Amino acid sequence: SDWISFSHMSSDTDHFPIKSWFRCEQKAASRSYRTLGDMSHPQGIYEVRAAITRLISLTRGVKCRPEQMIIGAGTQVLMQLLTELLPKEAVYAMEEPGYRRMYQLLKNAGKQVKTIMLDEKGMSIAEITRQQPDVLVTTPSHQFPSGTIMPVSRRIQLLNWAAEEPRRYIIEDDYDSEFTYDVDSIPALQSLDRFQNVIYMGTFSKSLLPGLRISYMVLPPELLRAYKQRGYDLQTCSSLTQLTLQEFIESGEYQKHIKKMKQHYKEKRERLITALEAEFSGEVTVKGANAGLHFVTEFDTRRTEQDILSHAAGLQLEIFGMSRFNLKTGRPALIIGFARLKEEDIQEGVQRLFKAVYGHKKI
Amino acid sequence: MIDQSDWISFSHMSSDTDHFPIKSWFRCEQKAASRSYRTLGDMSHPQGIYEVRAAITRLISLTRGVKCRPEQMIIGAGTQVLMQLLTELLPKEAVYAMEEPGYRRMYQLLKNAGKQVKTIMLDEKGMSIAEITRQQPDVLVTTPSHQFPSGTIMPVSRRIQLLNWAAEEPRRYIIEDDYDSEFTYDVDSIPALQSLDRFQNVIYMGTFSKSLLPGLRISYMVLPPELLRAYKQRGYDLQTCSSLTQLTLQEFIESGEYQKHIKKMKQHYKEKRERLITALEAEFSGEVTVKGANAGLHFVTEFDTRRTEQDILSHAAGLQLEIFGMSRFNLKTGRPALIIGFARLKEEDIQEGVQRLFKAVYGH
Ligand SMILES: Cc1ncc(/C=C/c2nnn[nH]2)c(/C=N/[C@@H](CCC(=O)O)COc2ccccc2)c1O
Ligand SMILES: Cc1ncc(/C=C/c2nnn[nH]2)c(/C=N/[C@@H](CCC(=O)O)COc2ccccc2)c1O
């Protein structure tokens, strides 16, 4: 195929060390084959949880005991489980724009879900305070999709809000947090909390592969108590997959991989920005590009988003429109992911985009 | 002394890691990866990769006569996630009914979702249609190929009474849980209940987690059109089975490795069951009643003994014999009945195992 991907929901496969991953799986398998049908703790194998605990304490400042952690095949199963540990009449609140899939999950569960618009610092604490929800879903590292990084002041506002009344919860979806360009790392919301009002949720899908689904969540001890009272849950990650993750982490292959990828995506992001800036000269507006694996581009042009995307599809440019992320007019806005984008396709990538916005490039 | 490690297991909740072709599984995974690596980076179709679903569909039509299209099938990491999903596709206020004795874990899942769950006793033909029509549930959970745990194979005639019952009123459904259906022994090679479902009241539930790599959970669910339509209305589900685990399973099947393994295992289990039956019959000479064999990986033993089912169980730990009593499969009182599972039982251990059991039962 001659497709070029500006997709945010695909991941790199050319730079993921799949041979290392398989070697770790062989090493795990050799270490624990006798017990493979035995290590089935519903929360995840303890040592896997401890390995992830150590990792996210180092790289995110998350503080927690392995016993608080729950591993799962993907963020959806963990979220669904979460909605059953939280009070059943909890009013939820989601960033708009945001993760519509999760919006739909909460609606389908019959939950009330308020939509909290963004401002320059991320999820609006004014809309939060006005609408008085019980549970926040927020993406502080790199707002999904707008790309805004929640500054520390706004984190503190959200935590003060959770702290002012019993039984308010912040679900911190730290998706896309493994990378930070032209700015340093901000400690996680969970890390700043002087209390225990944050559920930390992380995923390995952006850093290993969507193909494999591994996610986890760190419960505040009281939601852990409700979880432990259930008595019937089964782990959804295969034991060998968990042990492979453990070996991949404790061998150092994981941290080696992230470091190399941090450099790769930084240079890719820079070059892709320069190329968008030369091709569009000033008629592109780029925002949300200080972290994560995508940013936003707004375009000064006359066609609809449904049209610009319909042309790009014809021109074999995989790209998505910002309208997809309304939970529910202006100039067209698109999501440029660059995780799957080959460096050698950057120049030809913007062209096709510079042509999907209308149909040409006369110069 | 009394070697502490010398445990013999009669437990049903197992699968012989020893006998699984682990190297063939990894070679299939490697072949899948060579063919499709540039595809792991994509998002699986939410139902599961089509070609995986198609391979499973071809398999279960051959091996069970299930009649379905890959389009109807939903892959998931274990039966529980699929059952949770199912409870959300079925009407909120649906009234469920499960076999008693049965699978406590699914009972707990349903009750924790706030569902009314009826418990339905067995007769000689399995789940009691008479109790079903008395207690008036909407959705049945049943194990027709080999009732868990009594081991009764529901005969065609009772299958038809269930199908008739479901067709009589709107919003009835039959969940066919076809666990441990990869094995039958010399009788009752009867196809899936779903193969008779002229009116689309059946949801077929199958699983590989007994057949494949220990610790791996791959299950699937075949949905009738109205529930499939309800599933497509959601628009937000993410496939829980790793794409590469799906592609390995597909290679395992289409390379023939999967069926080769089942033929071998089936043979192994038929002989092990035979040898274990001959031994129980020799040791107990009629003071034992075996029922619920001819399929699966466990059967039931009723014992000719003044001892308590709980006295036998506690003496059994005292002999390093891991065994389970029928009493543990009540959801929520006479001759003692035990579940003999021979999944993780060594042929070396058959003669010792029944002799230990004889002293669990009688004390001498
Ligand atoms: C804020 C947020 N929170 C969780 C997830 C999903 C998590 C997960 N964790 N484990 N499994 N799934 C997503 C992304 N969702 C998909 C597309 C969004 C959409 O356009 O709908 C992309 O999925 C991935 C693709 C490649 C790599 C990693 C994720 C997300 O934006
Ligand atoms: C009627 C029925 N339906 C599905 C499943 C499991 C499905 C699955 N697939 N993937 N993930 N979960 C089981 C599980 N039974 C286990 C629990 C025993 C208990 O405590 O009662 C024991 O293991 C087995 C023993 C004998 C046969 C099969 C399994 C079951 O009984």
mmCIF file with all atom_site columns, C-alpha atoms and ligand atoms in Angstrom, chain A residues 234, chain B residues 12-14 77-80 102-106 143 148 177 179-180 207-210 216-219 297-298 328-329, ligand 2:
data_model
loop_
_atom_site.group_PDB
_atom_site.id
_atom_site.type_symbol
_atom_site.label_atom_id
_atom_site.label_alt_id
_atom_site.label_comp_id
_atom_site.label_asym_id
_atom_site.label_entity_id
_atom_site.label_seq_id
_atom_site.pdbx_PDB_ins_code
_atom_site.Cartn_x
_atom_site.Cartn_y
_atom_site.Cartn_z
_atom_site.occupancy
_atom_site.B_iso_or_equiv
_atom_site.pdbx_formal_charge
_atom_site.auth_seq_id
_atom_site.auth_comp_id
_atom_site.auth_asym_id
_atom_site.auth_atom_id
_atom_site.pdbx_PDB_model_num
ATOM   1  C CA  . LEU A 1 234 ? -10.960 -13.054 36.930 1.00 0.00 ? 234 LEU A CA  1
ATOM   2  C CA  . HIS B 2 12  ? -11.459 -30.360 38.056 1.00 0.00 ? 12  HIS B CA  1
ATOM   3  C CA  . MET B 2 13  ? -10.150 -26.740 37.872 1.00 0.00 ? 13  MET B CA  1
ATOM   4  C CA  . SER B 2 14  ? -7.026  -27.534 35.909 1.00 0.00 ? 14  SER B CA  1
ATOM   5  C CA  . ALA B 2 77  ? -10.519 -12.628 27.187 1.00 0.00 ? 77  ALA B CA  1
ATOM   6  C CA  . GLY B 2 78  ? -12.439 -15.298 29.044 1.00 0.00 ? 78  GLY B CA  1
ATOM   7  C CA  . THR B 2 79  ? -16.113 -16.138 29.454 1.00 0.00 ? 79  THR B CA  1
ATOM   8  C CA  . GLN B 2 80  ? -16.710 -13.633 32.258 1.00 0.00 ? 80  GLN B CA  1
ATOM   9  C CA  . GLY B 2 102 ? -23.743 -24.954 39.019 1.00 0.00 ? 102 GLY B CA  1
ATOM   10 C CA  . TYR B 2 103 ? -21.083 -22.295 38.435 1.00 0.00 ? 103 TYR B CA  1
ATOM   11 C CA  . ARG B 2 104 ? -21.011 -20.098 41.549 1.00 0.00 ? 104 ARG B CA  1
ATOM   12 C CA  . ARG B 2 105 ? -18.795 -17.451 39.944 1.00 0.00 ? 105 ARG B CA  1
ATOM   13 C CA  . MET B 2 106 ? -21.336 -16.606 37.232 1.00 0.00 ? 106 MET B CA  1
ATOM   14 C CA  . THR B 2 143 ? -24.532 -26.641 30.141 1.00 0.00 ? 143 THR B CA  1
ATOM   15 C CA  . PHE B 2 148 ? -21.292 -28.627 35.341 1.00 0.00 ? 148 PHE B CA  1
ATOM   16 C CA  . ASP B 2 177 ? -22.352 -22.550 27.928 1.00 0.00 ? 177 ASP B CA  1
ATOM   17 C CA  . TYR B 2 179 ? -17.404 -25.483 28.414 1.00 0.00 ? 179 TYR B CA  1
ATOM   18 C CA  . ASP B 2 180 ? -15.363 -28.749 28.363 1.00 0.00 ? 180 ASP B CA  1
ATOM   19 C CA  . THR B 2 207 ? -13.972 -21.197 25.274 1.00 0.00 ? 207 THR B CA  1
ATOM   20 C CA  . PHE B 2 208 ? -10.463 -22.397 24.431 1.00 0.00 ? 208 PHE B CA  1
ATOM   21 C CA  . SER B 2 209 ? -9.016  -21.813 27.923 1.00 0.00 ? 209 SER B CA  1
ATOM   22 C CA  . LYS B 2 210 ? -9.123  -25.555 28.682 1.00 0.00 ? 210 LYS B CA  1
ATOM   23 C CA  . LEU B 2 216 ? -4.366  -17.875 28.505 1.00 0.00 ? 216 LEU B CA  1
ATOM   24 C CA  . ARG B 2 217 ? -8.026  -16.862 28.280 1.00 0.00 ? 217 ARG B CA  1
ATOM   25 C CA  . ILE B 2 218 ? -9.631  -16.846 24.819 1.00 0.00 ? 218 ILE B CA  1
ATOM   26 C CA  . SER B 2 219 ? -13.402 -17.209 24.661 1.00 0.00 ? 219 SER B CA  1
ATOM   27 C CA  . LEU B 2 297 ? -12.715 -34.012 32.345 1.00 0.00 ? 297 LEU B CA  1
ATOM   28 C CA  . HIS B 2 298 ? -14.551 -34.924 35.540 1.00 0.00 ? 298 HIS B CA  1
ATOM   29 C CA  . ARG B 2 328 ? -19.185 -26.613 46.837 1.00 0.00 ? 328 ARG B CA  1
ATOM   30 C CA  . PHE B 2 329 ? -21.243 -26.207 43.657 1.00 0.00 ? 329 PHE B CA  1
HETATM 31 C C1  . LIG C 3 .   ? -20.092 -24.051 33.555 1.00 0.00 ? 2   LIG C C1  1
HETATM 32 C C2  . LIG C 3 .   ? -18.781 -23.269 33.343 1.00 0.00 ? 2   LIG C C2  1
HETATM 33 N N1  . LIG C 3 .   ? -18.674 -22.418 32.324 1.00 0.00 ? 2   LIG C N1  1
HETATM 34 C C3  . LIG C 3 .   ? -17.574 -21.717 32.099 1.00 0.00 ? 2   LIG C C3  1
HETATM 35 C C4  . LIG C 3 .   ? -16.489 -21.883 32.957 1.00 0.00 ? 2   LIG C C4  1
HETATM 36 C C5  . LIG C 3 .   ? -15.143 -21.158 32.867 1.00 0.00 ? 2   LIG C C5  1
HETATM 37 C C6  . LIG C 3 .   ? -14.839 -20.425 31.820 1.00 0.00 ? 2   LIG C C6  1
HETATM 38 C C7  . LIG C 3 .   ? -13.720 -19.558 31.270 1.00 0.00 ? 2   LIG C C7  1
HETATM 39 N N2  . LIG C 3 .   ? -13.094 -19.657 30.067 1.00 0.00 ? 2   LIG C N2  1
HETATM 40 N N3  . LIG C 3 .   ? -12.155 -18.694 30.056 1.00 0.00 ? 2   LIG C N3  1
HETATM 41 N N4  . LIG C 3 .   ? -12.185 -18.033 31.195 1.00 0.00 ? 2   LIG C N4  1
HETATM 42 N N5  . LIG C 3 .   ? -13.139 -18.560 31.981 1.00 0.00 ? 2   LIG C N5  1
HETATM 43 C C8  . LIG C 3 .   ? -16.538 -22.778 34.012 1.00 0.00 ? 2   LIG C C8  1
HETATM 44 C C9  . LIG C 3 .   ? -15.312 -22.860 34.960 1.00 0.00 ? 2   LIG C C9  1
HETATM 45 N N6  . LIG C 3 .   ? -15.054 -23.757 35.817 1.00 0.00 ? 2   LIG C N6  1
HETATM 46 C C10 . LIG C 3 .   ? -13.870 -23.492 36.619 1.00 0.00 ? 2   LIG C C10 1
HETATM 47 C C11 . LIG C 3 .   ? -14.359 -23.019 37.991 1.00 0.00 ? 2   LIG C C11 1
HETATM 48 C C12 . LIG C 3 .   ? -14.746 -24.212 38.890 1.00 0.00 ? 2   LIG C C12 1
HETATM 49 C C13 . LIG C 3 .   ? -15.613 -23.766 40.081 1.00 0.00 ? 2   LIG C C13 1
HETATM 50 O O1  . LIG C 3 .   ? -15.090 -23.134 41.035 1.00 0.00 ? 2   LIG C O1  1
HETATM 51 O O2  . LIG C 3 .   ? -16.850 -24.016 40.105 1.00 0.00 ? 2   LIG C O2  1
HETATM 52 C C14 . LIG C 3 .   ? -12.989 -24.718 36.843 1.00 0.00 ? 2   LIG C C14 1
HETATM 53 O O3  . LIG C 3 .   ? -12.282 -24.923 35.640 1.00 0.00 ? 2   LIG C O3  1
HETATM 54 C C15 . LIG C 3 .   ? -13.010 -25.828 34.838 1.00 0.00 ? 2   LIG C C15 1
HETATM 55 C C16 . LIG C 3 .   ? -13.270 -27.115 35.322 1.00 0.00 ? 2   LIG C C16 1
HETATM 56 C C17 . LIG C 3 .   ? -13.990 -28.013 34.543 1.00 0.00 ? 2   LIG C C17 1
HETATM 57 C C18 . LIG C 3 .   ? -14.446 -27.604 33.293 1.00 0.00 ? 2   LIG C C18 1
HETATM 58 C C19 . LIG C 3 .   ? -14.191 -26.318 32.826 1.00 0.00 ? 2   LIG C C19 1
HETATM 59 C C20 . LIG C 3 .   ? -13.473 -25.423 33.597 1.00 0.00 ? 2   LIG C C20 1
HETATM 60 C C21 . LIG C 3 .   ? -17.719 -23.471 34.226 1.00 0.00 ? 2   LIG C C21 1
HETATM 61 O O4  . LIG C 3 .   ? -17.791 -24.358 35.307 1.00 0.00 ? 2   LIG C O4  1
#
